[PDB]
UniProtKB/Swiss-Prot annotation, chains A, B:
Its main location: nucleus. It comes from Homo sapiens. The chain holds residues 496 to 680 of 701 of the full protein. This is Protein mono-ADP-ribosyltransferase PARP12. The modification ADP-ribosyl aspartic acid is found at D103, D114. Interacts with PARP11; this interaction plays a key role in zika virus suppression. Interacts with ISG15. It is found in: Nucleus; Golgi apparatus, trans-Golgi network; Cytoplasm, Stress granule. The lineage of its organism: Eukaryota, Metazoa, Chordata, Craniata, Vertebrata. Residues 1-183 form the PARP catalytic domain.
Length: 183, 183
């Protein structure tokens, strides 16, 4: 089995936090469901990655963000079980990694349906320290002035990031599935 | 459940037919397993599509081919349950459709692993009547001199095709999964 999706009540704090983040940039759309994803196997490897990044950061808390990923309904269960893996599709770019967006409105362009109902993840991402990306990058580049340290993620802007590229699947947990309609 | 994968004995006729087709263009590689995919739901919709194409062809047999598709191991079960759907990834082309290759050696470029073991489908495809494709095509174009008939698939060459683009998932059954190594 591996995972459960728990449908949230729309009057719950947990639902309202996810809804608020979605509604911030897709206010003209209508949310039909929000499910919490429970996959203890994906959460264990995420927490292990986090502990490794925390140690490498002097023992201080790693930069961790909730970021959107628009998908097709048909892969949702595959991602809840196996996580995001950019190697399924490739990219043809800010890096050959999985992409996540700050804005639901940006991830909406990648939620394909042929139907009224669209699906989007809100994922938990250990972005850590980031730098601008490049379409050649297969992993994040070295930090200047360090002989033995690399960035954790690539972005569009360091002063103002809105897209993140993740090269390691253990840096992501697919935390929530959002179903919505555009009318 | 939906599907079973039945591992074939390597001394069976059924295994030798698949192996022969793979070995034709990847003779330097080593096949480790061949599984027959049994999904009665995917086979029913394939046979219904076939009957529709047969009626449209004057009741005569539709052009049907065994064509390769290289994948990652992580989507194999998803395809055995849900079939090929090009809308998972998009294309960025001979058409926005699922691609299949005559030659295993060509599909090998899309079998990603980070391991020794690679995976490839041999799918059953109702290619029907075909015409050259184009990166704009979202479905196959009209037949010249017909007011109410379209092609069934797009290709690279009509006199000599080697790549097929399929826009309708009911035109494909994922019949066999091939695992092989490159050493
Ligand atoms: C510009 C575009 C680039 O996208 C890069 C592709 C990507 O990141 N992928 C695709 C394949 N994937 C996956 N597929 C099936 C499975 C399972 F489980 F079935 F095997 C697992 N993983 C992991 C995610 N950016 C997108 C693309 N899609 N959605 C957005 O939100 C965004 C962006 F940029 F807005 F965040
Ligand atoms: C040039 C390249 C263009 O490929 C076009 C993409 C394509 O056809 N796809 C990708 C996504 N897909 C799928 N993904 C996950 C699922 C599930 F179940 F997880 F949801 C279902 N469907 C259906 C197939 N051509 C390839 C690409 N890959 N392999 C080859 O052999 C070839 C070619 F051309 F050599 F035949
Ligand atoms: Cl990834
Ligand atoms: Cl398709």
């Amino acid at each position: 089995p591996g995972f459960q999706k728990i449908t949230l009540s729309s009057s719950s704090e947990e639902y309202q936090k996810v809804w608020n983040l979605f509604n911030r940039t897709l206010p003209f759309y209508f949310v039909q469901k929000i499910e919490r994803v429970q996959n203890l196997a994906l959460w264990e490897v995420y927490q292990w990655q986090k502990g490794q990044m925390q140690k490498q950061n002097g023992g201080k808390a790693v930069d961790e963000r909730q970021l959107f990923h628009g998908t097709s309904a048909i892969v949702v269960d595959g991602i809840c079980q196996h996580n995001f893996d950019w190697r399924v599709c490739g990219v043809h770019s800010y890096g050959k990694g999985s992409y996540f967006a700050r804005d639901a409105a940006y991830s909406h362009h990648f939620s394909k349906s042929d139907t009224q109902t669209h699906t989007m993840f809100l994922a938990r991402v250990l972005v850590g320290e980031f730098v601008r990306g490049n379409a050649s990058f297969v992993r994040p580049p070295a930090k200047e002035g360090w002989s033995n340290a690399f960035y954790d993620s690539c972005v569009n802007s360091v002063s103002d990031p809105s897209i993140f590229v993740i090269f390691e699947k253990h840096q992501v947990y697919p935390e929530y599935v959002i179903q919505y309609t555009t009318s």
